[model samples]
Target: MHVKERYKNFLNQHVGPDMSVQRCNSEIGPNNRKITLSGTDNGCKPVNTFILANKRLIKTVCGRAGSPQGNMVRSNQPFPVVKCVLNNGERHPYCEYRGTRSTRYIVLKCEEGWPVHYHEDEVNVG
Candidate 1:
């Protein structure tokens, strides 16, 4: 499958409120990684679709990717950050997250036709 299609399928399958861990668990890519989704029980919300370097619209989820060890980082630089907020003295496994969408360009490094690493470009940031 094309990169864009793969990305779209990935996001749709793994990055949403209705994501299935059972399904995603077996869907490891050539990158040799599994989808680790972070957010509320509602999963992640995409602010917009990604555009390719060639200016083609690609179906991708534009947002910060997070993990249990805090937020995800790429190349030592924070790609996007998601902040979890506590309300009414909430505790673990029941806390709330304030999702922050990323405006940077989403670039995926592909290996064997699958996305291995995610890179963000901040050139458009002002």
Candidate 2:
């Protein structure tokens, strides 16, 4: 309902911690990935990727693109990130993921110069 809230949600969901490959499993897991709001539980995301870039830099992509996917923007500069995929045949509360690290361009849905949804990452850029 608010752009500010979207920004916060962006940070919590897609804009994750620093680029440390070793901290993947420890900092990200099923237990803490699930979201609960007003007693309603949002199930764990099957595939989530972290955009490891500064907020200011990430925001720059908002006005740079017209819209690649439903008002989404693709970042020109690549950022290091961790990709977590849920284990095969798993659900929330029993969700487990395998994390892999990579440096790529982030695709995001931005609103008012802030990212709200993380779509995917691209790897074919320099």
Candidate 3:
């Protein structure tokens, strides 16, 4: 099976029975790694969509790739520093843009500060 298809099945098998799964890769990522599944409990609010990995379960904030996944902040503006948060809760500010189509996912490299550090702006009073 293909990477995306495999991942989709994995999510369908795991997510709550009442939930509905929808997969779309028409927008971002490698066109294969992005799989979206929506879960609705009360049949009114389609609460969450789970993004899954073929080998594991990945928790992604929805609307991430322009689809409703969860509370997400979308901006067309680009920042010099690419921001990312790892599965282990490690926050990173650098992301490497891969792929040839100008579509890529932020993969953290150790050289980009593996041991992440956050510094507060220095306050100076005149």
Candidate 4:
């Protein structure tokens, strides 16, 4: 299913909450550039989470907490995350980010029973 395929892309790009990230991936030019110029590649997420859990585990939360506005959902149980906060919003190649390791109730969007997008820690869903 395309849903599962899309989920993989989301994971490769977003799901790595457990891996440690420095101020930025300056060592790799391409990666460093990516973290910055996302108005084209992807939005520069001011605050993002790298989830340290498997898709199956996340799917459970989606099934429970999901509400249709992008079909976003959150977990009651905290999940490991490396919360990345934007630091130096200068420009691409200089777009810097600092990460803080923490456990948070993961918030994200899902479709057809698979996690698709990660949401911010504080959400405005009523």
lDDT agreement with native, every candidate: 0.30, 0.63, 0.22, 0.61
Q: Which ten residues in a row have the lowest lDDT in candidate 4?
A: 27-36
lDDT of 2 at 17: 52
How does model 3 fare in lDDT? 0.22
**Best candidate (score: lDDT):** 2
Model 2: what TM-score? 0.71
For residues 1-126, what per-residue lDDT tens digits would candidate 4 score against the true structure? 588887886676566533666633452124632543345554344655567777667677777644454456767788877766666544455545777777777777777777877776652211
lDDT per residue (tens digit) for residues 1-126 in model 1? 476676555453323332222322223222323222345332222221222122112222222332122232222222232212222212222222322333243445443444433443222210
**How far does residue 10 in candidate 2 sit from its true spot (Å)?**
0.8
Mark the 10 consecutive residues where model 1 has the least summed lDDT.
51-60
Clashing pairs in 2: none
By the TM-score metric, which is better: model 1 or model 3? 1
Which residue pairs of candidate 1 clash? none
Most accurate candidate by TM-score: 2
Q: What is the lDDT of residue 87 in candidate 2?
A: 52
- Model 2 over residues 61-126: C-alpha lDDT tens digits? 786633465556777767788886655433345445567889877788877777777775433211
Candidate number with the higher lDDT (1 or 3): 1
